[model samples]
Target: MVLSEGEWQLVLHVWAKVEADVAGHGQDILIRLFKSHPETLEKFDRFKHLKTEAEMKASEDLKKAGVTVLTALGAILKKKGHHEAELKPLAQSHATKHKIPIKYLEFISEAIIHVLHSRHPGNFGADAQGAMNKALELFRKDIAAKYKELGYQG
Candidate 1:
């Protein structure tokens, strides 16, 4: 499904608020994900060693990783969620190289929403939340479709 005109407007407006500091927000998202689903840490070689929240917060690698993911999200948003070409290699790497399970995709989305709500409480009203939900649904579906195409099973 595609985002409605209003939904796209709402999503882009909200995104603009934190577009300048995607790294910080992305780091927070990863921190939340690791705390909520500790098993996810094992999937990341760079972050698996971080045992405490303080360590995670201080990790330069984690910060860079956050930038990577958040920047990719920014690109996807710019494309209005039509990111198949961009996501294909990422999906392949996550499936065959990283072996990330499909379920963890939802976890990442959850952490993202948590970060957005907590960081910019004023920006995310009901309409914004709905827009984000729809955008993330499309994001997950795109990656999952690539996963299936590669026969990764996860």
Candidate 2:
């Protein structure tokens, strides 16, 4: 997915705000994910059995984990994508190490993109949302491939 200079700048510009407000943005992303795909909550050992946004965000572990994810995403956003070879291991680990289900991987990407639009209201318009969606499409495709490479038979 090719991004125009303006779109790249827009994404990078919004990311600074997201990284700065990691607690808010990250919590929103997870909340969005759980709200839309509640079953995915079971995938997180630390988050299992939690049923409310407040309950989920109250956990320091969830906060820390959310921040960690956004921090890594911030790194990828700076590059305008997850193209670096360094990220390959991270992708492979989701399957080999974290064991995230293939379906949830897709949900994660969609949820993060929605978070951008929802969290940065007025900043991420259609163009910016499209750019982010495209970038995440690539990111998820890579992760899915790695998951398959690591013997994901389902």
Candidate 3:
């Protein structure tokens, strides 16, 4: 929740990669990622399954919101948008609603971090974080551009 810009840079880069073709390559990314950071799969029953888009994506608007968020954050490899007030609850709610374990979020964050920081030498940092923040801004602004929901009904 209190992620630093560097931390976020790691997340955003991974996100851009993951969402670039989530459905098509989700498995490959997950496999190589967890293989790289085996600890990422801790508490998992071993790659149980791919990400779910059942209810959320069906909402049309929520799908747009999600895409917006990811797309906006797609640029930065650092600096997170820290879910705005309305989105904050929705964030947790989505996790809880889907029965997602906290470890999943941990793994997701870790996986992304791995992608960004695992470059041959040092990995991307602050500048990537800045780009990620800008991306998140676009994501949220896109939502604000679409409907009344800021991603939270709560």
Per-model root-mean-square deviation over C-alphas: 1.0, 2.1, 10.6
Q: Roughly what TM-score does model 1 have, to 2 decimal places?
A: 0.96
**Of the candidates numbered 2 and 3, which has the greater lDDT value?**
2
TM-score of each: 0.96, 0.86, 0.35
Q: Model 3, stretches more than 4 Å misplaced?
A: 1-29, 33-82, 89-93, 119-154
Using TM-score as the measure, the top candidate is 1
Cα lDDT tens digits for candidate 1, 1-154: 8999889888898899878788899889999999999999999887888999999999999999999998888888878867878898889889999999989999999998888899888989888999999999998888888888899858
lDDT of 2 by residue, 1-154 (tens): 5667777787787787787888877788888888899888877888887878778878777778888888887777677653666577776677677777767867878888788876687888888787777667766666677667778723
Model 2 misplaced stretches (Cα beyond 4 Å): none
For candidate 3, write residues 1-154 as lDDT tens digits: 2446655556554565556564333333344445665554443442333244343233444334334434433433233543354444534444445434443444444544444455312335566644444454443443333233433322
lDDT computed for candidate 3:
0.43
Q: Model 1: runs farther than 4 Å from truth?
A: none
Q: Compared to the true structure, candidate 2 yields what TM-score?
A: 0.86
Go through the candidates in order and give each one's C-alpha lDDT.
0.89, 0.76, 0.43
